Amino acid sequence: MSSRKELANAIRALSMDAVQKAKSGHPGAPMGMADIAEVLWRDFLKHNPQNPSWADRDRFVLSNGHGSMLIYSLLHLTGYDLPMEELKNFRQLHSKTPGHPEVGYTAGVETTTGPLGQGIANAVGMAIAEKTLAAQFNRPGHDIVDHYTYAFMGDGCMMEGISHEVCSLAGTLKLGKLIAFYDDNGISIDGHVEGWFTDDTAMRFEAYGWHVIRDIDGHDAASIKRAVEEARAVTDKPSLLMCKTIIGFGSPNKAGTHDSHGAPLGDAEIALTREQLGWKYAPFEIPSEIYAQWDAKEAGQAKESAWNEKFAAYAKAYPQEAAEFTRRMKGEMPSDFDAKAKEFIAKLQANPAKIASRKASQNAIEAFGPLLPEFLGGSADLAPSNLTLWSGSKAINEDAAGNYIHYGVREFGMTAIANGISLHGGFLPYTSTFLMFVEYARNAVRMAALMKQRQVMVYTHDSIGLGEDGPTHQPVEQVASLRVTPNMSTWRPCDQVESAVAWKYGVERQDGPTALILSRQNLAQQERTEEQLANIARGGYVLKDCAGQPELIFIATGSEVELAVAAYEKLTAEGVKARVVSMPSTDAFDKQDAAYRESVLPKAVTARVAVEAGIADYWYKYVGLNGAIVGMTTFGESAPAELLFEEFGFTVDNVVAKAKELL
Amino acid sequence: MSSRKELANAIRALSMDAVQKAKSGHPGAPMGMADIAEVLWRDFLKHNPQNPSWADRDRFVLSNGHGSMLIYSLLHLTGYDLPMEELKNFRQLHSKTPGHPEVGYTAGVETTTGPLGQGIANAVGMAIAEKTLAAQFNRPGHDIVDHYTYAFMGDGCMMEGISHEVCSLAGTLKLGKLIAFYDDNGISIDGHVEGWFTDDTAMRFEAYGWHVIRDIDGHDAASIKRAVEEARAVTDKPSLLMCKTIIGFGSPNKAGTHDSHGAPLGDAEIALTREQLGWKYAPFEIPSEIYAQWDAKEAGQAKESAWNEKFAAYAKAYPQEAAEFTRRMKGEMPSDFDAKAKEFIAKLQANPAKIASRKASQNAIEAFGPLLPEFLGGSADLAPSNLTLWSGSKAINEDAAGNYIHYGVREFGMTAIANGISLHGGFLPYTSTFLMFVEYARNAVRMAALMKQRQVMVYTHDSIGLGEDGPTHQPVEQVASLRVTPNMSTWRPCDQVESAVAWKYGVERQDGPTALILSRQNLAQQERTEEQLANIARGGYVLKDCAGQPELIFIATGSEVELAVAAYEKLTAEGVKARVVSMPSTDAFDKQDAAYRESVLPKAVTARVAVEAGIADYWYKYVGLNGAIVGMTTFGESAPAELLFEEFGFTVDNVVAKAKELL
Numbered sequence A, B: 001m002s003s004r005k006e007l008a009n010a011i012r013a014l015s016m017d018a019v020q021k022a023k024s025g026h027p028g029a030p031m032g033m034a035d036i037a038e039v040l041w042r043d044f045l046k047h048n049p050q051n052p053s054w055a056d057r058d059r060f061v062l063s064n065g066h067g068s069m070l071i072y073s074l075l076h077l078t079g080y081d082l083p084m085e086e087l088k089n090f091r092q093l094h095s096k097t098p099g100h101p102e103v104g105y106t107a108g109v110e111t112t113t114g115p116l117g118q119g120i121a122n123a124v125g126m127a128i129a130e131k132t133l134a135a136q137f138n139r140p141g142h143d144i145v146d147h148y149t150y151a152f153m154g155d156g157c158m159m160e161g162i163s164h165e166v167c168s169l170a171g172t173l174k175l176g177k178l179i180a181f182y183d184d185n186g187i188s189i190d191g192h193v194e195g196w197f198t199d200d201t202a203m204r205f206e207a208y209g210w211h212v213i214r215d216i217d218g219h220d221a222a223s224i225k226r227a228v229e230e231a232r233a234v235t236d237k238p239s240l241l242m243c244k245t246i247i248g249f250g251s252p253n254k255a256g257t258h259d260s261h262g263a264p265l266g267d268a269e270i271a272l273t274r275e276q277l278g279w280k281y282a283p284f285e286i287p288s289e290i291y292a293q294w295d296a297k298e299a300g301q302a303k304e305s306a307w308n309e310k311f312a313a314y315a316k317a318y319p320q321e322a323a324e325f326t327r328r329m330k331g332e333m334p335s336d337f338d339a340k341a342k343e344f345i346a347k348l349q350a351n352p353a354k355i356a357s358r359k360a361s362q363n364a365i366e367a368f369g370p371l372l373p374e375f376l377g378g379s380a381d382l383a384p385s386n387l388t389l390w391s392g393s394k395a396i397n398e399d400a401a402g403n404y405i406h407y408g409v410r411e412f413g414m415t416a417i418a419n420g421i422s423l424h425g426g427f428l429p430y431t432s433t434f435l436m437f438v439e440y441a442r443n444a445v446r447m448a449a450l451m452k453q454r455q456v457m458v459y460t461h462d463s464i465g466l467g468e469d470g471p472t473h474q475p476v477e478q479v480a481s482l483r484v485t486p487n488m489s490t491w492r493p494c495d496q497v498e499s500a501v502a503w504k505y506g507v508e509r510q511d512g513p514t515a516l517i518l519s520r521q522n523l524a525q526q527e528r529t530e531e532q533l534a535n536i537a538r539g540g541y542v543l544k545d546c547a548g549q550p551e552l553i554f555i556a557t558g559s560e561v562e563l564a565v566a567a568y569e570k571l572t573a574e575g576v577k578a579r580v581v582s583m584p585s586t587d588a589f590d591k592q593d594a595a596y597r598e599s600v601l602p603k604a605v606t607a608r609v610a611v612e613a614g615i616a617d618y619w620y621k622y623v624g625l626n627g628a629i630v631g632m633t634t635f636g637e638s639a640p641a642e643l644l645f646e647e648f649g650f651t652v653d654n655v656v657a658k659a660k661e662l663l
């Protein structure tokens, strides 16, 4: 017979007690948002704790991810597979309750947050995925896609620039099933936010085309419930609920203070908080009657069973559509994709074309597009330069059943939206910008790798080869930054064949992202045997060789393979024993077993010459201390590209000369 | 005899002709903004072409930097040292007219733009610098600081998240002398912007607290002038002028189209444009009467001479303050700073303390603060964690003559604002956040290095040593990314003494930024001779040694130096000739003479073991192919730091074992 406030206080108790036992963590936000979470989760959220993978569940995102005990409490109380022992192991090694929530670690966590702002970006992507999937698959009388995307966010997320990027786009795309709750508590780590944060946030979001509900009492369940009902009734705009809350609600001495944000309350303060809240139970003790009101297993089972019957009827009327929905929601590839993609790759090798690898990428999209209806691609206002459109592209701002997103000049927001799209299921996202401006999206790229998400990242104009735009645009050190990122795959293809191989590798990579490093300028196609063609996917392989132990091994990537081969030919004609290794993917090469790596870069050969129009320091990993590196050590310059390659030493004469110093 | 429209058409002609001659560049925005520029530069801008370094000049920033021929036209026409021959060498190797404007390359260019959004961020920083410098130095009857900051920006800047960060903060700080012109032309690279950009931008900026002037006819001099007059009369709010323009104005067939954005118009179209504009002059022909109306040399010298006389009277009344103003505007250090800082460093070595290097950083700020009144420091909402406040910090939102900025949760905007502060003159900015979230500001960090700007970047919580917050917060590969950035200095100090040396190195840099990599946890102080103490500033030095040529060299940084020393003690006791090298700065080490680097890392010693809680791949540069690396190869985990170091191999047993594998 517990009131709604008592049910919300169960969150407050678990959160402050788990933080206290860990001696680490953030009690303030869970305590401030517990009443909002109680209304959302018990009255509106459509979910099944017994199947967190239900395709048509509502999605919930905690963008203020430091309040991780909020989501752990909700998952535990509603009946997910997250036992009380895991809450007692909050922030402990290998527990299911890490200090910030991580997808895959924990039943029912939808995304990994912690980096402020990216949660709401992920939620925008999930709402775009639902809207697009519903438009693609729903049929008259068979609305098999119909779910909401709810997000919690705080002052930190609102101040971050990425909130502007993704909430602006969400207004453009009229994401009426996206409902965000703003924890308007007036506190951040430096103290009272008025010293640095004075936006009329409601007016700002109305400028984006959002429906905004002002001045909600975040500690009054009836007020919260009425607001959510209003937001769900507005079907043509995303909704922002401005919830006035007290951080650390319940703590007599730390509520409303920055002290409650990110440190344990302390045992004496917790005792006083129990007395103020009227919460009598000991740490990690929850009575059966409170579990009875929180549990979602019976309602969740019933809702998913109803949906399963709806999907079964859909599968009868629309069998091919239903098979595709199941395939795409599972992330499985079409059964014939491997064979058709290999046939395309073989055709390219047999039919040389000297084209830019950005064009080879577009040709792969055109080839794979008819086979991968799950593609949801886009570019950050650079479709005619990145070459991301194919004949079958259809912008979703024109047709909601389309497959292409004009992201605007929003690299960070684009990449984190795409993380939300990949997390949702049903799609294979690709994103695109000039390689330099990956630096604007850098942490979302890292988050894709950390979350093991499939996304193809199409990064063009990869070096001084772009020419006159100059050093603010010319990448030098960006590829190295990607190569040292754990679980990132990075490909710098040297011709149209390596480009198609890299695209196939990316779409088939189920457990992490793949960045394609693509040229502005035309790249010569290299000759390959059948064995060499198959070895491209091994990341590094012997392209040109000699009999016996080489005196020199050239290691080259991308547009510089043509230069390395030319130097190899000059040296071979003078009687030098040389080898050329093409290294389109250092990460794929590193994953090959020791025997294969020894066959490509034998330990006996120390005279190694790396050639790449990128930062030189990276290449010590493969050249060692007794070789040479023909690379960049400076920023670029504004000039025609052919003059730049000459000025910076990417000439046959310089490569030959640096190699001869090792003989 | 020339009308204002004919004067603006000189910009149009020079811009379209120089783009055509280069067969490269962006004619549309210069042609669209030429009328706005004519009014701003001829009727309002206070500047002297004969001294572009005049301390009290207005600052102009082209945030839509692809329109570079706009600023080159203006600088040439008003009389700067930018001859017609340089405009005929637009985008050519070593010209003063690179494809995007670069500070230092060209008289009168205030900042380097090209990366969208960062120009307006730099402008916010310049306006903060002017407001703060005025508060510090102006005296009754002596207002020696009084100038405006004017910025041009387009749709790309408005879409970028950084515009939200810096314009939100500009509203909070009430930057009444900041006036921005929005080129509202409806076009971006993908086409008509309504498919991806639908903000009520005026309402958005009113939410920031800006004064906004809607619906300006950007091709009508009277409308523009009236709007600028209104914006200058609003002294307590930054102003945004919504200028409706036609991109490529004048071109019958490409005006208002994405085609005019980023490609030469073509010879035929330029001829049609001359006819439509009524422009009768050949390419690169400007008649003397048009120069006479544009030239700013006479008026600008009069204005600067008037200011010189004002400063002289200030110096009579306030001689110590005038001397400081001159010193700080020139960027010179106090003459006794070197000696006083060395005294502080020596005191630290003689009085050992085991403290976190973030605390040692705070202690260096406390020691240097009284000596460097030019400090204008801040943190992105992490003052209590980064430890950026000292006893003399005064926030400028409380006291305009202060020295500290609460930046809010805005890492990218903070860093690009600080670039504007350093470009303005008068200050030495420092910025700060958790090291992980440098990834949010990555391209602004790069721009500081590219522009050769002095800024100290204080990055704390540098490894898995931060503990329970987990892998979204624990840096692994970020330090390696900074280390390979051209013209970046990166320091990872191992105790409070190395931390003080690194701070001294950073503030004494005259030509680039310095990133400090600082621990959460306490670091033991190392014993040093006088020679070792002096060699910290060489970036790498011998900390522990043997007699004769070493058999084994440990190379360690930051918090892992203690681990390396413990392994050294174990192997030394066994009778191994071991050495420990402390490498707080790889870039300072690399710049040393070859004999010094050989004395530290002798080329004959291949048994090298690098030890650092960061990505392993970086260290091949110093250990080669025949050593060992005790580093990270994965993301982190949420757990207490002591357990993480054990789990990931940062133990004496593992370091010793990897060393014995080389012997």
Ligand SMILES: CC1=C(CCOP(=O)(O)OP(=O)(O)O)S/C(=C(/O)CO)N1Cc1cnc(C)nc1N
Residues within 6 Å of the ligand: A028, A029, A064, A065, A066, A114, A115, A116, A117, A154, A155, A156, A157, A183, A185, A187, A188, A189, A247, A261, B380, B381, B382, B409, B434, B437, B440
């Ligand atoms: C600055 C910061 C916080 C501000 C919190 O203020 P808030 O209004 O969102 O939250 P509460 O009201 O809950 O205090 S939470 C936090 C953490 O490191 C922990 O994730 N950090 C550092 C941080 C900085 N920058 C980014 C991109 N992410 C972060 N997590």
Ligand SMILES: CC1=C(CCOP(=O)(O)OP(=O)(O)O)S/C(=C(/O)CO)N1Cc1cnc(C)nc1N
Residues within 6 Å of the ligand: A380, A381, A382, A409, A434, A437, A440, B028, B029, B064, B065, B066, B114, B115, B116, B117, B154, B155, B156, B157, B183, B185, B187, B188, B189, B247, B261
């Ligand atoms: C997308 C993009 C531009 C369009 C900008 O449209 P706009 O409205 O600002 O300008 P116009 O009206 O003048 O079309 S200009 C351009 C370039 O690379 C060139 O700098 N880029 C790519 C680009 C992407 N992201 C960033 C951060 N900077 C860029 N310069």
Ligand SMILES: [Mg+2]
Residues within 6 Å of the ligand: A154, A155, A156, A183, A185, A186, A187, A188
């Ligand atoms: Mg808050």
Ligand SMILES: [Mg+2]
Residues within 6 Å of the ligand: B154, B155, B156, B183, B185, B186, B187, B188
């Ligand atoms: Mg535009």
